[PDB]
Amino acid sequence: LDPGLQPGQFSADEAGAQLFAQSYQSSAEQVLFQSVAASWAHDTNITAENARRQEEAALLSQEFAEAWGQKAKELYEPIWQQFTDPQLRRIIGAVRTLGSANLPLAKRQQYNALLSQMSRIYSTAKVCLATCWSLDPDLTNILASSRSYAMLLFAWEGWHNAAGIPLKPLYEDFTALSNEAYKQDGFTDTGAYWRSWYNSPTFEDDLEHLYQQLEPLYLNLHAFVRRALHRRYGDRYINLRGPIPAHLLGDMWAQSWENIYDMVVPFPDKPNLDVTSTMLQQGWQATHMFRVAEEFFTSLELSPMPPEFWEGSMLEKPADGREVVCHASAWDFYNRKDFRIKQCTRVTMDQLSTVHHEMGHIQYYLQYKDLPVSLRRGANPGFHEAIGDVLALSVSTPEHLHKIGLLDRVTNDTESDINYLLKMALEKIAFLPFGYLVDQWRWGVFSGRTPPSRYNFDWWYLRTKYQGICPPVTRNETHFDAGAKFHVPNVTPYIRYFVSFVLQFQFHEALCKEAGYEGPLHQCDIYRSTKAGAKLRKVLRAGSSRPWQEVLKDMVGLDALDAQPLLKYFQLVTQWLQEQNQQNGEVLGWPEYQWHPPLPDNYPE
Ligand SMILES: *[C@@H]1O[C@H](CO[C@@H]2O[C@@H](C)[C@@H](O)[C@@H](O)[C@@H]2O)[C@@H](O[C@@H]2O[C@H](CO)[C@@H](O[C@@H]3O[C@H](CO[C@H]4O[C@H](CO)[C@@H](O)[C@H](O)[C@@H]4O)[C@@H](O)[C@H](O)[C@@H]3O)[C@H](O)[C@H]2NC(C)=O)[C@H](O)[C@H]1NC(C)=O
Ligand SMILES: CS(=O)(=O)N[C@@H](CCCCN)C(=O)NC[C@H](CC1(C(=O)N[C@@H](Cc2ccc(O)cc2)C(=O)O)CCCC1)C(=O)O
Ligand SMILES: *[C@@H]1O[C@H](CO[C@@H]2O[C@@H](C)[C@@H](O)[C@@H](O)[C@@H]2O)[C@@H](O[C@@H]2O[C@H](CO)[C@@H](O)[C@H](O)[C@H]2NC(C)=O)[C@H](O)[C@H]1NC(C)=O
Ligand SMILES: *[C@@H]1O[C@H](CO)[C@@H](O)[C@H](O)[C@H]1NC(C)=O
Ligand SMILES: [Cl-]
Ligand SMILES: [Cl-]
Ligand SMILES: [Mg+2]
Ligand SMILES: [Mg+2]
Ligand SMILES: [Zn+2]
C-alpha cells in the first residue's frame, strides 16, 4: 500500500476517533476512485487484460480496508460503541468491519477471481441455434415480442441453461468465502450484513407485513393475466387453476409484465398507452431519450448532467466488435467530477423508464458529491433506487406523454384510467413478489438453510410460492436458474428494489402534494414543479448522513415504509380487477401447484 494511504497515529478516545475518521475519508476517496475506474474500464470492454487490472484494483482496496480497519480496532474496538456522536459511531463501526479484507491474501485473490469469472459468464453467455443470440438485445426482444410458445421456450431454456449451469460451482465457492469474511466482522453470515444497512431490528417482519397487504393485488392481477394468456395460448399451455409458465409474461424473469400489455388491455379503443411505436415512427434514438430525461430533472431545478457525463457515458451497445456488460448501470467515480451511465439503450417506452431510473442514480451522486465519501450513499439503498422511478411515474402519465409529443389523443374517462392503472400494475405490481423473493432465496443460501444440493429446488419453491409461475421445461439441481439473473453472479443485493417499489409511491404522494396538485394521485405530473424539486433535493443532498427513518419523516411525514400510498394509487384498478375476476369465476391463486405445461410437439424445433 502506498505510504500516502496508510493510517498514522491517533489518540485512543473519542476526540482522536474524530481525527481518525477525518483522515480515513481523505484517503478513502483516492482508493474509491481507482476501484471505480478499474471496474468501468472492464465492463465497457471485456478483455482478459482489463479483468486482471480490475482484480489488482480490488486487491488494493482490501489492503486499505485492512490497514485502517486494524487501526480502528487497535484504538477504538472496546469504546466506539459508547461514543456520544452517532455519526461517528456509524463511521467507526463501518471501518472496523473489514469484509473480504479479513480474508488472507490467497483467499482474497480467489474471491476477486470468482467475482470476475462470475461476471464474465453472465455477460458473455449466448444461445446458439453457427450463429448465436445475446441476452441484450436478441433474447430480450424475443421474450418481449414473440408470441410463439416454442420460440419463447427456446430462448428461456437456452438462456437459463447457458448462464446458470456453469455458474453453480463458482457461486458455491463465492458464498463460502463471503461468509468466511463477514463472520470475522461479527455477522452470522453475509445476508445479515446486507440486512444491517437498513438499521431496523424488525426488518424481515416489517417486509413480510408489507407483502401481506400487497399480495391480494398481485393475486388478482395474476388471475386476470392468466385468463388473457389462456385465450391466446389455449388450455394445453395455460392452466386456469395452476401456475403460469415462466416464459410467457414478456420478460426473461417474468418480473415485469409491461410487454404483454397488448394482450391484457381492457379497453383497446382508448388511446394506446404503449408509445414505443410512436418513438420508432418519430425516430427517437438513445441520445434523445437521455436528453428528455435530463430536461425533466432540470424542470425541477435539479442539476443537468455535466459535460464529463456526456463525454464519458456509453449510451448504446458498441457495434465495433467489443464485448461489454449490457446490463444498465450508473457510476460514481468518487472524484466529484466523473459520473457516467453505461446502457445498451433500445428505443422503447420501458427503456425510457430505465433511462430515468439510471439518471436518478446520477442525480443523487451529483447532489451529495461534496459530503465525506462515506456519506455518499442513499439514506438506505432503496432510496437510491426510488429517485428515478418517481420521476418516471410522472413521465408515464398520458397527460405528460401528450406534452412531449408521444400521445396525440387526450382522454379523461374511467376506461382510460383503468387502462393506465392496469399498464402500471403490469410494471409495478407484477414485480413485487419477485422483488421480495430474490433475497429470501439468497439469505437462505448465505445462512446455510439452502445448501448447494437445494439451490434450484428452493429457487423454484419461492418462484411458485410468490409469483405463481412454473418452469416450462423440467429442471433439476444441475440447473442453477437463480444464476441466470444478473444480480446473483454480480453479487448485487435485491431487497432494495422491493423497498423502492413501495417507497416510490410514498415519494410520489409527498411530491405531488408539495407541488400543489389536487387531482387523483395516478394523474399527478410533477413536471416543472420547483417546489417538488426542492423537497426532493433535500433528500438527495443528505446522502447517508442521517438515519433513513428521519429523512423519510422530513419528506413524507412518516418514519416507516408504508403500503398505503401504493394502494391509493392503484385503488380503482384493484377494485376493477377484483370485480372482473369474480364475474369471470376465476380461481385466485394456483392450487394445482404441481402443474407444468407439456413440451411442444416438435420441440426443440
Ligand atoms: C380527470 O377528471 C377528474 C374528475 O373530474 C371530476 O369528476 C368528473 C366526473 C366531472 O364531474 C369533472 O367535472 C370533475 O372535475 C379530475 O379530478 C378532479 O380534479 C379536481 C382538480 O382539478 C379536484 O377538485 C379539487 O378537489 C380538492 C380536494 O377536494 C376533494 O376531496 C374531498 C375529500 O376531502 C372529496 O370528497 C371531494 O370530491 C372534493 O372534490 C379541492 O380542495 C380543490 O379545491 C378542488 O375542488 C377533484 O377533487 C378531482 N376529482 C377526483 C375524483 O379526484 C382530474 O383532475 C381529471 N384529470 C385530468 C388529467 O384532467
Ligand atoms: C453498483 S453500480 O456502481 O454499478 N451502480 C448501481 C446503482 C448504485 C446505487 C447505490 N446503491 C447500478 O447501476 N445498478 C444497476 C441496476 C440496473 C437496473 C436493475 O438491475 N434493476 C432491477 C430491478 C428494477 C428496478 C427498477 C425498475 O424500474 C425495474 C426493475 C432489475 O432489472 O432486475 C436495470 C435497469 C433498471 C436498474 C440499477 O440501476 O439499479
Ligand atoms: C438433469 O437435467 C440434465 C439436462 O437434461 C435435460 O433436462 C432434464 C431436466 C430432462 O428434461 C432431460 O430430458 C433434458 O435433456 C440431464 O443431463 C442430460 O441428460 C440427457 C438425458 O436425458 C443427456 O442426453 C444429455 O447429454 C445430458 N446433458 C444435457 C446438457 O442435456 C441430467 O442427467 C439430469 N439429471 C441430473 C442428475 O443432472
Ligand atoms: C479495450 O481494452 C484493451 C486492453 O485490454 C485496450 O488495448 C483497448 O484500447 C480497449 N478498447 C477500447 C475501445 O477502449
Ligand atoms: Cl446506497
Ligand atoms: Cl439492499
Ligand atoms: Mg417493452
Ligand atoms: Mg420490460
Ligand atoms: Zn437502480
Side-chain angles (χ1 to χ4, degrees), residues 510-535:
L511 296 176
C512 293
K513 179 180 170 181
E514 182 72 6
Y517 174 79
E518 281 179 76
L521 178 61
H522 62 277
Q523 289 172 342
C524 166
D525 175 15
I526 63 166
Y527 189 59
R528 286 176 175 164
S529 175
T530 65
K531 280 227 281 179
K535 183 165 194 61

CSV table of all heavy atoms in Angstrom, one decimal, residues 510-535:
chain,number,residue,atom,x,y,z
A,510,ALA,N,-46.0,12.5,-1.7
A,510,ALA,CA,-45.4,13.7,-1.0
A,510,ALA,C,-45.1,14.8,-2.0
A,510,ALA,O,-45.3,16.0,-1.7
A,510,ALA,CB,-44.2,13.3,-0.2
A,511,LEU,N,-44.5,14.5,-3.1
A,511,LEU,CA,-44.1,15.5,-4.1
A,511,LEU,C,-45.3,16.1,-4.8
A,511,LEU,O,-45.3,17.3,-5.1
A,511,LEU,CB,-43.1,14.9,-5.1
A,511,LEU,CG,-41.8,14.4,-4.5
A,511,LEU,CD1,-40.9,13.7,-5.6
A,511,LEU,CD2,-41.0,15.6,-3.8
A,512,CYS,N,-46.2,15.3,-5.1
A,512,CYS,CA,-47.5,15.8,-5.7
A,512,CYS,C,-48.2,16.7,-4.8
A,512,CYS,O,-48.6,17.8,-5.2
A,512,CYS,CB,-48.3,14.6,-6.1
A,512,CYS,SG,-47.6,13.6,-7.4
A,513,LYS,N,-48.2,16.4,-3.5
A,513,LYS,CA,-48.8,17.3,-2.5
A,513,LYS,C,-48.0,18.6,-2.4
A,513,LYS,O,-48.6,19.7,-2.5
A,513,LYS,CB,-48.9,16.7,-1.1
A,513,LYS,CG,-49.5,17.6,0.0
A,513,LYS,CD,-49.5,16.8,1.3
A,513,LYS,CE,-49.9,17.7,2.4
A,513,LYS,NZ,-49.9,17.0,3.7
A,514,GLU,N,-46.7,18.5,-2.4
A,514,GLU,CA,-45.9,19.7,-2.3
A,514,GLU,C,-46.0,20.6,-3.6
A,514,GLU,O,-45.9,21.8,-3.5
A,514,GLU,CB,-44.4,19.3,-2.1
A,514,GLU,CG,-43.4,20.4,-2.0
A,514,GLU,CD,-43.5,21.2,-0.7
A,514,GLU,OE1,-44.2,20.7,0.2
A,514,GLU,OE2,-42.8,22.2,-0.5
A,515,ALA,N,-46.3,20.0,-4.7
A,515,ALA,CA,-46.4,20.7,-6.0
A,515,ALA,C,-47.8,21.4,-6.1
A,515,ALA,O,-48.0,22.1,-7.0
A,515,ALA,CB,-46.3,19.7,-7.2
A,516,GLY,N,-48.7,21.1,-5.1
A,516,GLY,CA,-50.0,21.8,-5.2
A,516,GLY,C,-51.0,21.1,-6.0
A,516,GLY,O,-52.0,21.6,-6.3
A,517,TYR,N,-50.7,19.8,-6.4
A,517,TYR,CA,-51.6,19.0,-7.2
A,517,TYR,C,-52.8,18.5,-6.3
A,517,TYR,O,-52.6,18.0,-5.2
A,517,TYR,CB,-50.9,17.9,-7.9
A,517,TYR,CG,-51.7,17.0,-8.7
A,517,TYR,CD1,-52.2,17.3,-9.9
A,517,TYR,CD2,-52.1,15.8,-8.1
A,517,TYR,CE1,-53.1,16.5,-10.6
A,517,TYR,CE2,-52.9,14.9,-8.8
A,517,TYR,CZ,-53.4,15.3,-10.0
A,517,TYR,OH,-54.2,14.4,-10.7
A,518,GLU,N,-54.0,18.6,-6.9
A,518,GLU,CA,-55.1,18.2,-6.1
A,518,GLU,C,-56.1,17.2,-6.8
A,518,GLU,O,-57.2,16.9,-6.3
A,518,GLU,CB,-55.9,19.4,-5.6
A,518,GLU,CG,-55.3,20.1,-4.4
A,518,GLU,CD,-56.0,21.4,-4.0
A,518,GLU,OE1,-57.1,21.2,-3.3
A,518,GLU,OE2,-55.6,22.5,-4.2
A,519,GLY,N,-55.6,16.6,-7.9
A,519,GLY,CA,-56.4,15.5,-8.5
A,519,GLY,C,-56.0,14.1,-8.0
A,519,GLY,O,-55.4,13.9,-7.0
A,520,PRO,N,-56.5,13.1,-8.8
A,520,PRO,CA,-56.2,11.7,-8.5
A,520,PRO,C,-54.7,11.5,-8.5
A,520,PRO,O,-54.0,12.0,-9.4
A,520,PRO,CB,-56.9,11.0,-9.6
A,520,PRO,CG,-58.0,11.9,-10.1
A,520,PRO,CD,-57.4,13.3,-10.0
A,521,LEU,N,-54.2,10.7,-7.6
A,521,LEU,CA,-52.7,10.6,-7.4
A,521,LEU,C,-52.1,10.0,-8.7
A,521,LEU,O,-51.0,10.4,-9.1
A,521,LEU,CB,-52.4,9.6,-6.2
A,521,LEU,CG,-50.9,9.3,-6.0
A,521,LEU,CD1,-50.2,10.6,-5.7
A,521,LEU,CD2,-50.8,8.4,-4.8
A,522,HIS,N,-52.8,9.1,-9.4
A,522,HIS,CA,-52.2,8.5,-10.6
A,522,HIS,C,-52.2,9.4,-11.8
A,522,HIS,O,-51.7,9.1,-12.9
A,522,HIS,CB,-52.9,7.2,-10.9
A,522,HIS,CG,-54.4,7.3,-11.2
A,522,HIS,ND1,-55.3,7.4,-10.2
A,522,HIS,CD2,-55.0,7.4,-12.4
A,522,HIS,CE1,-56.5,7.6,-10.8
A,522,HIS,NE2,-56.4,7.6,-12.1
A,523,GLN,N,-52.8,10.6,-11.7
A,523,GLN,CA,-52.8,11.6,-12.8
A,523,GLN,C,-51.8,12.7,-12.5
A,523,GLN,O,-51.7,13.7,-13.3
A,523,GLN,CB,-54.2,12.1,-13.1
A,523,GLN,CG,-55.0,11.1,-13.8
A,523,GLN,CD,-56.5,11.5,-13.9
A,523,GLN,OE1,-57.0,12.4,-13.3
A,523,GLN,NE2,-57.2,10.8,-14.8
A,524,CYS,N,-51.1,12.7,-11.3
A,524,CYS,CA,-50.2,13.8,-11.0
A,524,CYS,C,-49.0,13.7,-11.9
A,524,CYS,O,-48.4,12.7,-12.2
A,524,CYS,CB,-49.7,13.6,-9.6
A,524,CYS,SG,-48.3,14.5,-9.1
A,525,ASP,N,-48.6,14.9,-12.4
A,525,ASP,CA,-47.3,15.1,-13.1
A,525,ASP,C,-46.6,16.2,-12.4
A,525,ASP,O,-47.1,17.4,-12.4
A,525,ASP,CB,-47.6,15.4,-14.6
A,525,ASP,CG,-46.4,15.7,-15.4
A,525,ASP,OD1,-45.3,15.4,-14.9
A,525,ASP,OD2,-46.5,16.3,-16.6
A,526,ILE,N,-45.4,15.9,-11.8
A,526,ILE,CA,-44.7,17.0,-11.1
A,526,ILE,C,-43.8,17.8,-12.0
A,526,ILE,O,-43.0,18.6,-11.5
A,526,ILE,CB,-43.9,16.4,-9.9
A,526,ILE,CG1,-42.8,15.4,-10.4
A,526,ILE,CG2,-44.8,15.7,-8.9
A,526,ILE,CD1,-41.8,15.1,-9.3
A,527,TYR,N,-43.8,17.5,-13.3
A,527,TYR,CA,-43.0,18.3,-14.3
A,527,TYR,C,-43.1,19.8,-14.0
A,527,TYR,O,-44.2,20.4,-13.8
A,527,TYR,CB,-43.5,18.1,-15.7
A,527,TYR,CG,-42.7,18.6,-16.9
A,527,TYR,CD1,-41.3,18.3,-17.0
A,527,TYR,CD2,-43.3,19.4,-17.8
A,527,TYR,CE1,-40.6,18.8,-18.1
A,527,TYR,CE2,-42.6,19.9,-18.9
A,527,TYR,CZ,-41.3,19.6,-19.0
A,527,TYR,OH,-40.6,20.1,-20.2
A,528,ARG,N,-42.0,20.5,-14.0
A,528,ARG,CA,-41.8,21.9,-13.8
A,528,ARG,C,-42.2,22.4,-12.4
A,528,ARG,O,-42.3,23.7,-12.2
A,528,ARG,CB,-42.6,22.7,-14.9
A,528,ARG,CG,-41.9,22.7,-16.2
A,528,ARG,CD,-42.6,23.3,-17.3
A,528,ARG,NE,-41.9,23.3,-18.6
A,528,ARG,CZ,-42.3,23.6,-19.8
A,528,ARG,NH1,-43.7,23.8,-20.0
A,528,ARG,NH2,-41.5,23.6,-20.9
A,529,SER,N,-42.4,21.6,-11.4
A,529,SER,CA,-42.6,22.0,-10.1
A,529,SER,C,-41.3,22.2,-9.3
A,529,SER,O,-40.7,21.3,-8.9
A,529,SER,CB,-43.5,21.0,-9.3
A,529,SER,OG,-43.6,21.4,-8.0
A,530,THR,N,-40.9,23.5,-9.2
A,530,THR,CA,-39.7,23.7,-8.5
A,530,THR,C,-39.8,23.5,-7.0
A,530,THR,O,-38.8,23.1,-6.3
A,530,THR,CB,-39.2,25.2,-8.8
A,530,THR,OG1,-40.1,26.1,-8.2
A,530,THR,CG2,-39.0,25.4,-10.3
A,531,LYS,N,-41.0,23.6,-6.4
A,531,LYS,CA,-41.3,23.2,-5.0
A,531,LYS,C,-41.1,21.7,-4.8
A,531,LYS,O,-40.5,21.3,-3.8
A,531,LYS,CB,-42.7,23.7,-4.6
A,531,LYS,CG,-42.7,25.1,-4.2
A,531,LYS,CD,-43.4,25.4,-2.9
A,531,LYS,CE,-44.9,25.3,-3.0
A,531,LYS,NZ,-45.6,25.5,-1.7
A,532,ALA,N,-41.7,20.9,-5.7
A,532,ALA,CA,-41.4,19.5,-5.6
A,532,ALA,C,-39.9,19.2,-5.8
A,532,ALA,O,-39.3,18.4,-5.1
A,532,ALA,CB,-42.2,18.7,-6.7
A,533,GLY,N,-39.2,19.9,-6.7
A,533,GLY,CA,-37.8,19.7,-6.9
A,533,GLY,C,-37.0,20.0,-5.6
A,533,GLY,O,-36.1,19.3,-5.3
A,534,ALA,N,-37.4,21.1,-4.9
A,534,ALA,CA,-36.6,21.5,-3.7
A,534,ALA,C,-36.8,20.4,-2.6
A,534,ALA,O,-35.9,20.1,-1.8
A,534,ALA,CB,-37.1,22.8,-3.2
A,535,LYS,N,-38.0,19.9,-2.5
A,535,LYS,CA,-38.2,18.8,-1.5
A,535,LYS,C,-37.4,17.6,-1.8
A,535,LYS,O,-36.8,17.0,-0.9
A,535,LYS,CB,-39.7,18.6,-1.4
A,535,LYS,CG,-40.1,17.6,-0.3
A,535,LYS,CD,-41.7,17.7,-0.1
A,535,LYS,CE,-42.2,17.1,1.1
A,535,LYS,NZ,-41.6,17.6,2.3
